[PDB]
Design a binder for this molecule. Structure first.
Ligand SMILES: [Mg+2]
Ligand SMILES: [Mg+2]
Ligand SMILES: [Mg+2]
Ligand SMILES: [Mg+2]
Ligand SMILES: [Mg+2]
Ligand SMILES: [Mg+2]
Ligand SMILES: [Mg+2]
Ligand SMILES: [Mg+2]
Ligand SMILES: [Mg+2]
Ligand SMILES: [Mg+2]
Ligand SMILES: [Mg+2]
Ligand SMILES: [Mg+2]
Ligand SMILES: [Mg+2]
Ligand SMILES: [Mg+2]
Ligand SMILES: [Mg+2]
Ligand SMILES: [Mg+2]
Ligand SMILES: [Mg+2]
Ligand SMILES: [Mg+2]
Ligand SMILES: [Mg+2]
Ligand SMILES: [Mg+2]
Ligand SMILES: [Mg+2]
Ligand SMILES: [Mg+2]
Ligand SMILES: [Mg+2]
Ligand SMILES: [Mg+2]
Ligand SMILES: [Mg+2]
Ligand SMILES: [Mg+2]
Ligand SMILES: [Mg+2]
Ligand SMILES: [Mg+2]
Ligand SMILES: [Mg+2]
Ligand SMILES: [Mg+2]
Ligand SMILES: [Mg+2]
Ligand SMILES: [Mg+2]
Ligand SMILES: [Mg+2]
Ligand SMILES: [Mg+2]
Ligand SMILES: [Mg+2]
Ligand SMILES: [Mg+2]
Ligand SMILES: [Mg+2]
Ligand SMILES: [Mg+2]
Ligand SMILES: [Mg+2]
Ligand SMILES: [Mg+2]
Ligand SMILES: [Mg+2]
Ligand SMILES: [Mg+2]
Ligand SMILES: [Mg+2]
Ligand SMILES: [Mg+2]
Ligand SMILES: [Mg+2]
Ligand SMILES: [Mg+2]
Ligand SMILES: [Mg+2]
Ligand SMILES: [Mg+2]
Ligand SMILES: [Mg+2]
Ligand SMILES: [Mg+2]
Ligand SMILES: [Mg+2]
Ligand SMILES: [Mg+2]
Ligand SMILES: [Mg+2]
Ligand SMILES: [Mg+2]
Ligand SMILES: [Mg+2]
Ligand SMILES: [Mg+2]
Ligand SMILES: [Mg+2]
Ligand SMILES: [Mg+2]
Ligand SMILES: [Mg+2]
Ligand SMILES: [Mg+2]
Ligand SMILES: [Mg+2]
Ligand SMILES: [Mg+2]
Ligand SMILES: [Mg+2]
Ligand SMILES: [Mg+2]
Ligand SMILES: [Mg+2]
Ligand SMILES: [Mg+2]
Ligand SMILES: [Mg+2]
Ligand SMILES: [Mg+2]
Lengths: 393, 46, 122, 240, 159
RNA sequence: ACCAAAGCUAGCUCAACAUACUAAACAAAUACAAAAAUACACCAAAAUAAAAUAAAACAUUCACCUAACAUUAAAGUAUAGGA
RNA sequence: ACGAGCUACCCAUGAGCAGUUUAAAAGAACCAACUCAUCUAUGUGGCAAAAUAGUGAGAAGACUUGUAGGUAGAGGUGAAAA
RNA sequence: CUCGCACACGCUUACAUCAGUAACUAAUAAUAUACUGAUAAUUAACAACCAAUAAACCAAAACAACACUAAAACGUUUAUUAAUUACAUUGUUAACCCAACACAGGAGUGCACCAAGGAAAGAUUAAAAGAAGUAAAAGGAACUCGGCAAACACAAACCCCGCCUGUUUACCAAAAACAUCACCUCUAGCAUUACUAGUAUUAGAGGCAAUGCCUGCCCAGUGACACCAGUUUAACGGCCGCGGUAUUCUGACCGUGCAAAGGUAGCAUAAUCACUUGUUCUCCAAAUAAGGACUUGUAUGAAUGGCCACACGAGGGUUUUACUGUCUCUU
RNA sequence: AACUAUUCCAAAAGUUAAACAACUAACUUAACAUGGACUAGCAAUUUCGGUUGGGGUGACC
């Protein structure tokens, strides 16, 4: 095998001990007396140093096994930044879930009713895009780190403007950065989705289940696809210190108990520091699922059972030019077995809000060919966005 | 082209090349300091 | 040819060179990068109430000086420990083992202001 | 003075790690090798050259891995492949037709019947047919591949005698090894690397090659066309 | 270190030359210290050990100048100490072996005050002597108390 | 008549003696980029002196040339040397 | 012993390159900043121990350039001009 | 008339206010940013200082949609611990630095082309010669080593040498020298500091100079392999005569000597010892110039490369136009 | 000479037979590594006799 250090680098082996230390029954004479190095004298050996009072900062790092929460069962954790190798496949398998192409038809009907549009949709949304992508900064060409959260929030505002027409929307509150811990056991593998998502829309009243019983029973016969060489745990964090407790980021008696929509931004300048669209889909599957599972174990409890009352959660995600829509229905708290009823997920993937954007007029042979602004605009994707925002009322 | 401007001042370079620490890090440097001390120089080093 | 003679001061180098003028550090660098002061490192001035007390910055001229005797460890021994030791040897209660009642201290590490490693500034 | 090599990183990573070129200079700072320096900036991908490497010591058996992607590598001539199995990924040197979304077997197991050889497969030499094409050849068993890693190169297994394999290196020299040593089956990636045409001196500079010297040296005795009988066979088999 | 003439003709070039000893790795057994040291020695060292009939003999039987090694002098200091002490820890289980061994070397036995100073560099010596002289200066309270007790006991005995 | 001129001191030199041989001054700061009170280490080491020159060149050789033993003689003797 | 703060070549780490022409940032083209130093005239104790004026060559590259580091004289460095 | 404001690096009070300047600095004064004295001054929000250990991440910057090849600087999150408590410390002037000078030189970046900065002339006179400019009758290279310089011109052709962009003698040479893509020889079977975290389609030591047609004969010498035989010239290097013959000059043929082979293809009065201003044709009124042929060059010649060629060249030569104070011949 | 590689002898560590014929020798060698040789590389030290109708060539001594 080829070992990966290099001798030159690895901290130098201690100097060969002085010859006077091999002679039995003889006290070597050292410079230890004079408190400094001297040539001609033997090198003193000192006891590992114990400053009888311990200092919080300058002490050695406590070994991991000493912690009260240490356990010998390796628990695989999924946090906000983990990438899954096979994204949606893995997500589904860990979640025990079937995938469905479009969005639920409830949501689409909500989307295609001309009653549900804003005053001028094309106008306002073209403006939201242009604002986010250009106008919101002093600089010529804003980076993504700014313009992704800006555009998501612009759209949230455009939808929030409908609180006038359907005044049930005030039953919601928005939250940022909550600790979420969902532990569950799947096929002898222990999984925990643990961490923070970016932004979370919570509601006072839960969301009506979107799948007819025919779907749920057609779920009973569906076989989970499997990737043989790759273990399903791939890309997670092997972790030996963890807590198993159901934790939604809020304590008891929270006035807005029901997770409604989760928002996942990819705001990073470099490509390699963002998620592949697929991996992102996986991320929101797992996290939506965790958010659901927490609740499901709050209103029912740790016992593993099929659910008489499904829990529904939504998720949206972004490049800032590209959107991922997801609706998840949780039907099952027993994931140990592979053979039962499976949870449901609808994923509308790779929905372009606009094709491209020009921040400076593009000029060819001293004429203006392409003006400043967005190229191509899909009112459809914003319509779906609105739909998901309006799912409560 | 034109010469004589060979000296382009930097304090970091100055003190890394000619400084006290640099003179004490090698036996030869120490002999420099010793010679200057002997001659009674006002400034032993930069 | 730069400057050899003039002393090396924070004013002289690049941005990266900051050398204090010799004031003493009051703290450390914290988590936020912001600086944290430690209330214990900041010297607390101990100032007596001067109002009701009579002494002045100068002395009357007709007031005499005196024969100058530098205080010695001996004189200090005799003004303090000698009367007590003599009193307790004359009564035979003298104990060469424990001198602590006379004010001798075997080791300094217990007390707040120690003399030999000199724990206090002033 | 003294410089420290960039080559210290203890843990294996599939992620590209940053490296410092040193044009021809040893750690003392003098030129050792002439004609090297200042190419494009390069990150380094760690290659696992031990093809058979059981993930956990718990299950020793022959295992199987999936090929995820086949990428260009700046550091070597061959193209490399990202290969994942169990919980782990690693870079391996890609065989000629290896493509993404593929399956590759790693096995230490011998048997009387040999094996039908696919490309990415790694087997002990003893397990292969006697005419097979191999690359990434170990010397002693467990050591890791050294020989035949360059782009488009292939050796060939010649024969099997006395619990030992004799193979033919790309230089057409013969090499004798224990038959317990692993090798990968096929020709290495990027076979046309031979026919690439550097267009201009500039490109050579991009590759980090500084021009030859200008001094004129009269050719000596060493030059000419020497025809030498092919050298005797190297044997890493240690006789008792 | 020296020079030579090439060909040994005095009329040829004169050339710097250095003659280096041939060194070997050999492990030697000390009886008195009961140990095997791995030491670099010459063929000459082995011949002198042979000639003096024991490793421990050779070390005890040779003067400081002839060994030339600081390690030789420390070996010697060690087993000289073990002889002057009659250290029981030599062979803890068998006083038979112990007396048997301490027997043959009885010619070299030297007192203890001498035995710990044998192999010492002037540096090590100065250090050792500095440590034996190490004292925390006596508090003036003590000294003044003793002067006062002297004076009080001579004031009590005079009446 | 300008420019100028004249001093006799500052100190030095060489020896003698001599105890014995790193002066004086240290409050803080000084081996971070010396003079910057305060954080887990590393630290350290040795190898023949050479040549200019003399030999009317230069090739073996070439006193003294940073190794205590002085003085009167033996004696520029025995010896050594491209003798 | 001391020198790579000039310069030769490296290593790290930053920074520049507008307009025009082209499917093209192609060691292409025109031409600034920038870098060089062709030819001439001045100058020749000079503004200058190598410059000034005009004129020229390159100008997304084997390009220019800042900062810190390296290699040392029996050596270094060198697209050889000793 | 236009090199301005700021920061970095550097400099170190040269800055500011009041006063003084007989003399000292300013290459001279007036007076004063630079001489002298006294007294003051730059205040942190900017800048410096400003956590470690594990773990998940194969997926460039280029308006980044997506790609190109030379494969690319720049971080999130999760876990484990991180003294917890107003005000810490330090840089903050300038007309400035490196060039012995208050030097027409050298100096990184961001913004500007003016709103900011500045003054070519101490006063005269209007000689020569010198410098820098503008104009010029008729002519238009007759100048001269050369159209050097100049010009109301800013075009065309042909050779030589190098393929090309590039590099070089800082301060007399920028080139035909070097490098270079390409093509060829040699040397290596391999592991933790170079080569290389590479493995013969690789890496070193060299030659030669892209492409195209080619690269002839020689291993006797000298090398180097093979420790001797033997092998090697894209290793160092070499590649011939005398006599007689077709009526006549020549010599297919003949004789014979010597060599390891006897200079092959090509090209040729050449950047090629001399003879040489070879001979002839073209160009000019006239040419030792230029170009084309002939050509034993008895001293050309094939990777110390030979021959053609595209494009390129501040390389070296030649012609035409045009342009002109180069010149007639100066003003 | 040193140094860098080659080759060899000795040093050092070993290993074998109890050798052969009739009525002591031989062989082995991982990295270091010593003494003495060998062949090369890379080098080190030193020198350019005089006369001459100026030197050089030729000639001479
Ligand atoms: Mg100078
Ligand atoms: Mg100076
Ligand atoms: Mg500073
Ligand atoms: Mg500064
Ligand atoms: Mg603070
Ligand atoms: Mg490489
Ligand atoms: Mg490659
Ligand atoms: Mg080459
Ligand atoms: Mg060359
Ligand atoms: Mg002489
Ligand atoms: Mg003389
Ligand atoms: Mg001489
Ligand atoms: Mg001498
Ligand atoms: Mg003799
Ligand atoms: Mg430098
Ligand atoms: Mg441009
Ligand atoms: Mg160009
Ligand atoms: Mg100019
Ligand atoms: Mg002009
Ligand atoms: Mg110009
Ligand atoms: Mg140009
Ligand atoms: Mg051009
Ligand atoms: Mg340096
Ligand atoms: Mg020399
Ligand atoms: Mg040299
Ligand atoms: Mg160069
Ligand atoms: Mg030359
Ligand atoms: Mg020359
Ligand atoms: Mg100055
Ligand atoms: Mg002033
Ligand atoms: Mg004046
Ligand atoms: Mg300022
Ligand atoms: Mg004037
Ligand atoms: Mg005039
Ligand atoms: Mg004129
Ligand atoms: Mg004119
Ligand atoms: Mg005219
Ligand atoms: Mg003419
Ligand atoms: Mg004429
Ligand atoms: Mg001209
Ligand atoms: Mg012209
Ligand atoms: Mg013209
Ligand atoms: Mg050229
Ligand atoms: Mg020059
Ligand atoms: Mg130059
Ligand atoms: Mg040029
Ligand atoms: Mg020039
Ligand atoms: Mg050339
Ligand atoms: Mg060819
Ligand atoms: Mg050619
Ligand atoms: Mg040939
Ligand atoms: Mg031969
Ligand atoms: Mg031969
Ligand atoms: Mg011809
Ligand atoms: Mg000729
Ligand atoms: Mg010839
Ligand atoms: Mg040749
Ligand atoms: Mg030739
Ligand atoms: Mg071309
Ligand atoms: Mg030309
Ligand atoms: Mg050029
Ligand atoms: Mg040119
Ligand atoms: Mg000599
Ligand atoms: Mg002569
Ligand atoms: Mg002469
Ligand atoms: Mg003559
Ligand atoms: Mg004459
Ligand atoms: Mg002669």
């Amino acid at each position: 095998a080829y070992e990966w250090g290099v001798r030159s680098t690895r901290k130098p082996e201690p100097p060969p001990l002085d010859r006077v230390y091999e002679i039995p029954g003889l006290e070597p004479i050292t410079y230890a007396g004079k408190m400094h190095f001297m040539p001609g004298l033997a090198r003193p050996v000192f006891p590992p140093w114990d400053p009888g009072w311990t200092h919080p900062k300058f002490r050695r790092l406590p070994p991991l096994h000493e912690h009260p929460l240490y356990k010998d069962q390796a628990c695989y954790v999924f946090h906000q930044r983990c990438r899954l190798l096979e994204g949606v496949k893995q997500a589904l398998w860990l979640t025990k879930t079937q995938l469905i192409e479009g969005l639920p038809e409830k949501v689409l009907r909500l989307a295609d009713d001309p009653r549900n549009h804003i005053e001028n949709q094309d106008e306002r949304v073209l403006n939201a895009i242009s604002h986010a992508r250009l106008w919101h900064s002093t600089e010529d060409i804003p980076k993504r780190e700014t313009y992704c959260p800006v555009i998501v929030d612009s759209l949230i505002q455009l939808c929030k403007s409908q609180i006038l027409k359907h005044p049930s929307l005030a039953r919601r509150i928005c939250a940022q950065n909550n600790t979420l811990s969902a532990t569950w056991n799947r096929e002898s593998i222990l999984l925990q989705v643990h961490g923070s998502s970016g932004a979370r829309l919570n509601a006072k009243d839960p969301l009506p289940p979107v799948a007819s019983q025919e779907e749920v029973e057609a779920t009973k016969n569906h076989v989970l696809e499997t990737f043989y060489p790759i273990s399903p745990t791939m890309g997670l964090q092997e972790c030996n210190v963890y807590d198993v407790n159901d934790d939604t980021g809020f304590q008891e008696g929270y006035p807005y108990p029901c997770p409604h929509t989760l928002y996942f931004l990819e705001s990073a300048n470099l490509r390699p520091r963002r998620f592949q669209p697929d991996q992102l889909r996986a991320k929101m599957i797992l996290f939506a699922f965790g958010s659901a599972l927490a609740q499901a174990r709050l209103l029912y409890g740790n016992d593993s059972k099929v659910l008489e009352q499904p829990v529904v959660v939504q998720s949206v995600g972004t490049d800032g030019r590209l959107f991922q829509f997801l609706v998840l229905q949780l039907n099952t708290t027993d994931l140990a077995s592979d053979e039962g009823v499976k949870n449901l997920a609808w994923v509308d993937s790779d929905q372009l809000l606009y094709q491209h954007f020009w921040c400076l007029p593009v000029i060819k042979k001293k004429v203006v060919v392409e003006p400043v602004g967005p190229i191509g605009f899909q009112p459809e994707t914003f319509r779906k966005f609105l739909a998901l925002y309006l799912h409560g009322a | 082209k034109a010469r004589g401007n060979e000296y382009q001042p930097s304090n970091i370079k100055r003190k890394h090349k000619h400084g006290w620490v640099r003179r004490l890090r090698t036996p030869t440097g120490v002999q420099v300091i010793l010679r200057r001390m002997h001659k009674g120089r006002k400034s032993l080093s930069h | 040819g730069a400057d050899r003679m003039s002393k090396w001061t924070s004013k002289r180098g690049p941005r990266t060179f900051c050398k204090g003028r010799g004031a003493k550090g009051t703290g450390f660098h914290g988590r936020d990068g912001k600086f944290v002061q430690i209330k214990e490192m900041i010297p607390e001035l101990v100032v007596p109430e001067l109002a009701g007390f009579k002494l002045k910055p100068y002395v009357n001229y007709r007031a005499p000086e005196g024969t100058d005797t530098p205080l010695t460890a001996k004189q200090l021994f005799l003004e303090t420990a000698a009367p007590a030791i003599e009193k307790d040897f004359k009564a035979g209660t003298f104990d060469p083992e424990h001198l602590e009642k006379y004010g001798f201290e075997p080791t300094q590490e217990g007390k707040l202001f120690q003399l030999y490693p000199k724990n206090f500034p002033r | 003075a003294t410089s420290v090599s960039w080559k210290s990183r203890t843990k294996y990573t599939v992620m590209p790690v940053k490296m410092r070129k040193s044009g021809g200079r040893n750690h003392t700072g003098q030129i050792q090798v002439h004609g090297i320096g200042g190419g494009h900036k390069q990150r380094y991908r760690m290659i696992d050259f031990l093809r058979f490497r059981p993930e956990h010591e718990s299950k020793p058996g022959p295992f199987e891995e999936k090929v995820i992607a086949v990428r260009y590598d700046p550091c070597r001539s061959a193209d490399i492949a990202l290969v994942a199995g169990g919980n782990r990924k690693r870079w391996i040197i890609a065989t000629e037709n290896m493509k993404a979304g593929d399956t590759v077997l790693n096995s230490d197991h011998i048997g009387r019947m040999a094996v039908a050889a696919r490309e990415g497969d790694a087997h002990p030499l003893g397990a292969l047919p006697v005419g097979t094409l191999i690359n990434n050849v170990e010397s002693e068993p467990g050591r890791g591949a050294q020989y035949i890693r360059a782009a488009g190169t292939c050796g060939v297994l010649l024969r099997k005698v006395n619990g030992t394999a004799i193979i033919q290196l790309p230089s057409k020299r013969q090499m004798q090894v224990l038959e317990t040593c692993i090798a990968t089956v096929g020709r290495v990636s990027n076979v046309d690397h031979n026919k690439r045409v550097i267009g201009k001196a500039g490109r050579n500079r991009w590759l980090g090659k500084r021009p030859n010297s200008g001094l004129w040296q009269r050719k000596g005795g060493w030059a000419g066309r020497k025809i030498r009988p092919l050298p005797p066979m190297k044997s890493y088999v240690k006789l008792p | 270190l020296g020079h030579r003439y090439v060909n040994n003709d005095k009329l040829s070039k004169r050339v710097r030359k250095v003659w280096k000893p041939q060194l070997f790795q050999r492990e030697l057994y000390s009886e008195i210290l009961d140990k095997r040291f791995t030491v670099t020695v010459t063929m000459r060292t082995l011949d002198l050990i042979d000639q003096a009939c024991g490793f421990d003999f050779y070390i005890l039987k040779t003067p400081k100048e002839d060994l030339c090694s600081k390690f030789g002098m420390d070996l010697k200091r060690g087993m000289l100490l073990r002889l002057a002490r009659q250290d029981p820890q030599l062979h803890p289980d068998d006083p038979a072996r112990r007396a048997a061994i301490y027997d043959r070397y009885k010619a070299f036995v030297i007192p203890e005050a001498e035995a710990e100073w044998v192999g010492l560099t002037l540096d090590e010596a100065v250090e050792k002597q500095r440590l034996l002289e190490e004292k925390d200066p006596i508090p003036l309270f003590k000294i003044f108390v003793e002067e006062l007790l002297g004076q009080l006991q001579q004031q009590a005995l005079s009446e």
